[PDB]
Every structure is written in structure tokens, then in C-alpha cells.
């Protein structure tokens, strides 16, 4: 019939293909360059989703995401290129994670086989944490503040605003938030939540009732951690619905 | 330097590439066939591990794992082929999971985008469970029984033998064990364990002491669930060490 659900195969697709680029030689040979290029070209033919194939092809033939011999120069250039392609897809989907190229380098380099000290167990322990540790998507603080009132009105208790309070103090600056020890907790919390909703078919936007059009309680809890399942357009749309409800409420009482 | 740790990129590699095969048309065109074949041929050039590339190439040029136009006939033939390639690698590593082609079909088909009823949330809920639900490796009951005595002697309490007791009653028949409701629990338990050991650098074989050469307590708990981090050769080796210790003990007392 159709292709496969993007949220099922997507992450494995990225993790594996980013790993492929970090397995590229520091000094490829004309042969290596040709072998990898052809691989990445063929990748565009097999992604199990038509639209995905089209966007990817478009991306690899324009701008800085263009697959060219300069990209294939070395490991740095190849890994930087795929990092950019990944950003290109994120932007297309209007979702952000706030990861710098350096972040991606520190992550995948910890995967590098270090047959020193077969790789030692304490070294792999570190690698595995980096593999299992998921980076949840980010939403700017100015967007989230539009949901605080309704979150309170719907009964979400005080403990759920803790992280938001920390973020406010740091002016919603992600580069600073990422340096906080609690950033690790933020990601683990958001991940369990996102998984909880996915596994229990919990929608992000209220389908019926008075709250129709605004975030569900679980989605609100995610937003309070500057995370969300919604993309930029969907968040702004949710904000507009929340304000329709607040405005109309004010005028009737 | 080297390639990347196989246990970090491997699973994403399989999940994504199996998803690729299920995204293959029911009736490919000469063009499709050529496009996918070239992709899978190039896959062998980019796996971030030299030995892995060699084995894969060897596999796709011999026996039933050979990449040929007959394989590329349709979705059934292509998915059956990659399932066989996966089995080939499992056999090379001497690790088993007991998954039939049908098992793999039921799993990946649940990933198929079903734009009926954008795919509905309750449908995705099912898909996500299949994605997150990991199948832990299996070890035959006759192998495991060699570790029961030492497991008892080392203080492992009774609750850890529960599943083993169920398995004994079913004659260690995996096709029957997989039909049990507790099979789902078995896999979740083994998965957390395997992850716990990986994340905490807990070895599978005692490095020092009197128990040197035999499974560590955590490894023993896994074995009691007919699971293990050890491959066939390593399990038989562990058995031999356990018997050296039992035999020598008997003769000195
Ligand atoms: C080549 C390719 C093309 C795709 N094209 C589409 C498409 O057009 N449409 C569509 O709907 N889906 C597409 N997808 C899937 C989509 O990109 C997501 O993977 C999917 O929506 C799942 O999202 P997620 O939130 O579950 O996790 P993911 O987005 O898969 O994973 C989140 C993780 O991504 C990492 N990350 C984020 N940004 C970067 C970066 N720049 N570099 C490295 N790691 C980063 C973080 O560490 C975070 O933990 C594509 C996937 C691939 C592999
Ligand atoms: C193309 C390729 C070649 C590889 N070659 C090597 C190699 O030569 N040497 C090496 O050390 N590593 C190799 N690896 C990696 C290795 O196969 C494992 O993925 C890795 O050891 C991680 O094992 P794991 O136990 O963490 O999980 P994994 O083995 O990655 O995942 C376990 C999951 O595999 C699924 N599964 C098991 N059998 C099948 C099957 N036949 N069909 C579909 N799903 C199945 C189960 O559902 C189970 O949950 C290769 C990986 C790929 C993608």
C-alpha cells in the first residue's frame, strides 16, 4: 500500500546514516568518495516514504546540502554535510532540537571503536548513555508563556512549572539551559512523556469539549519543559486558539 | 581512527534497512529493481566497520543471501532476502533471537502508513509498541540448566527462577514459550537487564576471584530467562568453566 510511518523508521534512519558518515576515512580515495557518494545518492531512492524521497533529493541538489565532491573531501566535510541535511529536514518539518555540529560530533565520536586500554566496558558505558539519551525538541520560552495561564486554569499542579521557572531566570537561553545539570533531567522527562503519549494514543490537541483546539494536559506538561510534539505552525495555531478562548472568556464575564 | 562500535549503530542499521525493504513496491519496475539493488550493493561499502563490510559482501554473493534479480522481484522476495541476510549475520556472531520470517512481517507491516479511519493514533500506538518492544536473544534450556546450581550457590533468590520453571514445563520449546503471555514480560525484563549492564559497564564473565570464568550474577539472572549477552561459543565456554569448578570442588570435599 503506502510507505512506512515516518516516526517509526526515521530515528533509526538518522542514527545509522550519521554513524555511516563518522565511519568515513580521514583521507578518502577517489574510490571511497565515489563509493559513499553513490550510497548517499541511492539513499534518496529507498527512504520508505515518497515525500521524504522528494525532499531529500531536492536538498542534496541545492544550497549547502548539495551532495558534491567538496563534501566528500574528508570525514569532517562529510559529517558536517549530513548534519546540515538533517537540519534541512528538521526545518522542513518545522521542528528544532538546538543541536550544534559540535554536539553531534561529541556524540558520534564517543561511538568510535577504541580497541585500547575490543573496546573497554567503561568506555562503552559512556557510548551507550549517549545512544539511549534522546534530545527532545525545543520550543522558545516566549511561545510557551502563552500556555501558562491555561495550564494553571486546567489544574496542572505547581511541580510541573519548576523547569519553566528555571528557564525564565535564564531568559529562555538554550545555550545556557543546556549547560545546566537539570538539562539531562528535562530530556529524560520529555522523552518518557512523548513515548507515553505515543504508546497510549494521547493526542496533542483537544479534539472535543470546551478546550477544543488547545493543548491536551500531557502536551501542556511537555510545553512547560520547553518541549512539544507540535511544530512551529502548530504551536502558533495552538496559541491563537488559546487566546480566542481567553479573549471570549474575558468579554462574557 | 577505527570504525564505530557495532552494538551502538547495529540496531538502527537493521531497523532502518528492514523498513527500506518493506517500502519496496509490490510490482517494482526495471528501474526500481536497479535503484534498490544498487542501494543494497552500496550499503556494503559504508557500514562503519571493516569486518562487517567484508562479511556482508561475502553474504550477498553466495547462497540464499546472494543479491540477485530474483530477490528484487517484489516486496515479498526483497523482505525475505534481507531477513535472511540478518539471520546470516546472527549466525556469524553465533547469537539467536528465534524470529521467523512471519514474525518480522507482522512487525514491519504494522509500520505501514495507513492513511485511513495521516495514520490514526490508536493504529500508531500499536506500531510504537512493536518498535519499542525489543526481542532479547535466546539460549536453549539444556545450556541454561548447567548454570542453575551455581546460580543457587551464589545466592540468587527463588523469584529469579520463576520463568525458568515455566520453561522447564514447556520443555524449553520457544515456539510455545512465545505464545505465552509472560513472553512479553521475559523480553522486557531481559532488555532492561542488558541495558543496565551496558550502561554500568557490568561484565558478563567474572574477571577475578574464585568465580573467574563463570557468569557474573547479572549474567546468571539473564540466563535464567533463557537470555544472555554471550554467543554460543562463549556459553559453552562458560559451561566448561562452571564444570571445572564443580568437579574440582567435589573432589576436594
Ligand atoms: C534521510 C531522511 C529523510 C527524512 N525526510 C522526512 C520528510 O521529508 N518528512 C517526514 O515527515 N519525515 C522525514 N524523515 C523522518 C524525520 O526526520 C524524523 O526522524 C521523524 O519525524 C521522527 O522524529 P522523532 O521526533 O521521533 O525523532 P528523530 O527526529 O528521528 O530523532 C531525534 C533525535 O535527533 C537528533 N538530532 C536532531 N537534529 C540533529 C542533527 N541536525 N544532527 C544529528 N542528530 C540531530 C537528536 O539527538 C534527537 O535525539 C526523514 C528521515 C531520514 C533519515
Ligand atoms: C547490514 C549489517 C551488517 C552487520 N554485520 C556485523 C558483523 O559482521 N559483525 C558485528 O559484530 N556486527 C555486525 N552488525 C551488527 C550486529 O548485527 C548487531 O546489530 C549488533 O551486534 C547489536 O546487537 P544487539 O543485540 O544490541 O541488537 P540487534 O541485534 O541490533 O537488535 C536485536 C533485534 O533484532 C531483531 N531481529 C533479530 N533477528 C532478526 C531477523 N532475522 N530479522 C529482523 N529482525 C531480527 C529482533 O527483533 C531484536 O529485537 C551488522 C549490522 C548491520 C545492519
Cα–Cα nearest to B135, from B106, B164, B166: B106
Residue after which a domain boundary falls, among A65, A93, A117: A117
Which method, experimentally, gave rise to this model?
X-ray
Residue B4 shares a structural domain with residue B108: yes
Chain B residues with CB under 8 Å of A105 CB are none
Cα–Cα nearest to B197, from A199, A154, A14, A122: A122
| Dist. CA A121–CA A20, nearest whole Å | 23
Which residue(s) pair with B119 in the sheet? none
Contact B36, B28 (CB under 8 A): yes
The ligand 1 atom nearest the CA atom of A44: 1
Task: List, in order, residues 6 or more apart from B230 with CB less than 8 Å away.
Answer: B139, B204, B205, B215, B219, B238
Residue A251 shares a structural domain with residue A159: yes
Give the DSSP letter of residue B159.
G
Give the cell for residue A65.
546540502
- Taking the CB of residue B242, how many other CB atoms lie within 10 A of it? 19
Task: List, in order, residues 6 or more apart from A155 with CB less than 8 Å away.
Answer: none
Residue A100 shares a structural domain with residue A136: no
| Dist. CA B47–CA B71, nearest whole Å | 21
Cα–Cα nearest to B221, from B192, B183, B180: B192
Contact B9, A111 (CB under 8 A): yes
**Chain A: nearest CA to B8, how far in angstroms?**
7
Residue after which a domain boundary falls, among A91, A117, A143: A117
Q: B87 CB less than 6 Å from ligand 2? A: yes
Residue A195 shares a structural domain with residue A214: yes
Contact B45, A39 (CB under 8 A): yes
Contact A141, A172 (CB under 8 A): yes
Cα–Cα nearest to B12, from A196, A131, A48: A131
Mutating which of B28, B30, B48 best tests the A interface, going by the most A Cβ atoms within 10 A? B48
Give the DSSP letter of residue A225.
T
Mutating which of A5, A17, A74 best tests the B interface, going by the most B Cβ atoms within 10 A? A5
| Dist. CA B76–CA B74, nearest whole Å | 6
- Taking the CB of residue A6, how many other CB atoms lie within 10 A of it? 19
Q: Residue A95 C-alpha to ligand 1 middle, in angstroms?
A: 9
Give the cell for residue B170.
514447556
Upper half-sphere CA count for residue B176 (Cβ side, 13 Å): 8
**Burial of A127 per CB tally in 10 Å (0-12, 13-18, 19+):** buried
Chain A residues with CB under 8 Å of B127 CB are 5, 8
CATH number at A49 reads 1.20.120.310
Residue after which a domain boundary falls, among A87, A117, A147: A117
Handedness of CA A217, A221, A223, A227 (dihedral sign): negative
**Resolution of the experimentally solved model in angstroms:** 2.2
At residue A125, what are phi and psi to the nearest 5 degrees?
A: -55, -45
| Dist. CA A54–CA A48, nearest whole Å | 11
Give the cell for residue A92.
522542513
Residue B157 shares a structural domain with residue B198: yes
| Dist. CA A218–CA A239, nearest whole Å | 16
**Burial of B89 per CB tally in 10 Å (0-12, 13-18, 19+):** middle
**Domain tally for chain B?**
2
At residue B215, what are phi and psi to the nearest 5 degrees?
A: -55, 145
DSSP assignments along A168-203, one per residue: HHTTT-HHHHTTSTHHHHHHHHHHHHHHHHHHTT--
Residue A101 shares a structural domain with residue A3: yes
Residue B9 shares a structural domain with residue B82: yes
Q: B1-31 burial, b if ≥16 CB within 10 A, otherwise e?
A: eebbbbbbbbebbbbbbbbbbbbbeeebeee
Which residue(s) pair with A4 in the sheet? B112
Upper half-sphere CA count for residue B76 (Cβ side, 13 Å): 2
At residue B205, what are phi and psi to the nearest 5 degrees?
A: -120, 135
* CA dist A59 → A94, B122, B158 (Å): 15, 33, 58
Helix axes A30-46, A50-59, angle to 10 degrees: 140
Give the residue numbers spanning the domain of B124: 118-253
Ligand nearest to the CA of A191: 1
Ligand nearest to the CA of A100: 1
Nearest-CB residue to A113 (from B2, B46, B195) = B2
Contact B217, B156 (CB under 8 A): yes
For chain A, first and last CA: distance in Å? 53
Q: A137-169 burial, b if ≥16 CB within 10 A, otherwise e?
A: bbbebebbebbbebbeeeebeeebbebbeebee
Give the cell for residue A247.
479573549
Residue B147 shares a structural domain with residue B184: yes
**Interrupted after residues, chain A (C–N over 2.5 Å):** 117
Residue B102 shares a structural domain with residue B161: no
Residue B103 shares a structural domain with residue B220: no
Ligand 1 pocket, residues with Cβ under 6 angstroms: A 6-7, 10-11, 13-14, 17-18, 47, 51-52, 55-56, 83, 86-87, 89-90, 92-93, 97, 99, 104, 134-135
Residue A138 shares a structural domain with residue A51: no
| Dist. CA A146–CA B213, nearest whole Å | 61
| Dist. CA B1–CA B122, nearest whole Å | 46
| Dist. CA A174–CA A76, nearest whole Å | 25
- Taking the CB of residue B168, how many other CB atoms lie within 10 A of it? 14
CATH number at A171 reads 1.20.120.1250
Q: B138 CB less than 6 Å from ligand 2? A: no
Residue A126 shares a structural domain with residue A15: no
| Dist. CA A214–CA B71, nearest whole Å | 49
Amino acid at each position: 500500500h503506502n510507505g512506512l510511518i515516518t516516526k517509526i523508521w526515521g530515528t533509526a534512519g538518522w542514527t545509522f546514516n550519521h554513524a555511516v558518515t563518522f565511519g568515513y576515512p580521514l583521507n578518502p580515495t577517489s574510490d571511497d568518495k565515489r563509493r559513499y557518494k553513490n550510497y548517499f545518492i541511492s539513499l534518496g531512492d529507498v527512504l520508505p516514504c515518497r515525500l521524504c524521497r522528494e525532499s531529500y533529493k531536492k536538498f542534496i541538489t541545492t544550497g549547502k546540502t548539495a551532495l558534491t565532491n567538496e563534501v566528500l573531501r574528508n570525514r569532517h566535510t562529510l559529517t558536517k554535510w549530513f548534519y546540515d541535511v538533517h537540519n534541512a529536514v528538521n526545518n522542513k518539518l518545522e521542528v528544532d532540537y538546538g543541536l550544534s555540529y559540535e554536539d553531534v560530533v561529541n556524540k558520534y565520536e564517543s561511538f568510535r571503536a577504541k580497541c585500547g586500554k575490543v573496546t573497554p566496558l567503561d568506555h562503552k558505558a559512556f557510548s551507550f548513555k549517549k545512544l539511549y539519551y534522546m534530545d527532545a525538541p525545543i520550543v522558545s520560552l516566549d511561545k510557551v508563556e502563552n500556555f501558562v495561564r491555561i495550564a494553571r486554569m486546567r489544574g496542572i499542579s505547581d511541580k510541573y512549572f519548576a523547569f519553566l521557572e528555571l528557564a525564565t531566570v535564564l531568559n529562555g537561553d538554550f545555550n545556557e539551559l543546556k549547560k545546566q545539570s537539570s538539562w539531562e533531567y528535562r530530556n529524560k522527562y520529555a522523552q518518557k512523556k512523548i513515548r507515553h503519549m505515543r504508546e497510549n494514543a494521547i493526542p496533542s490537541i483537544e479534539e472535543q469539549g470546551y478546550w477544543k483546539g488547545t493543548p491536551t494536559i500531557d502536551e501542556l506538561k511537555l510545553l512547560l519543559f520547553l518541549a512539544s510534539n507540535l511544530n512551529r505552525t502548530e504551536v502558533n495555531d495552538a496559541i491563537n486558539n488559546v487566546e480566542r478562548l481567553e479573549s471570549t472568556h474575558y468579554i462574557e464575564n
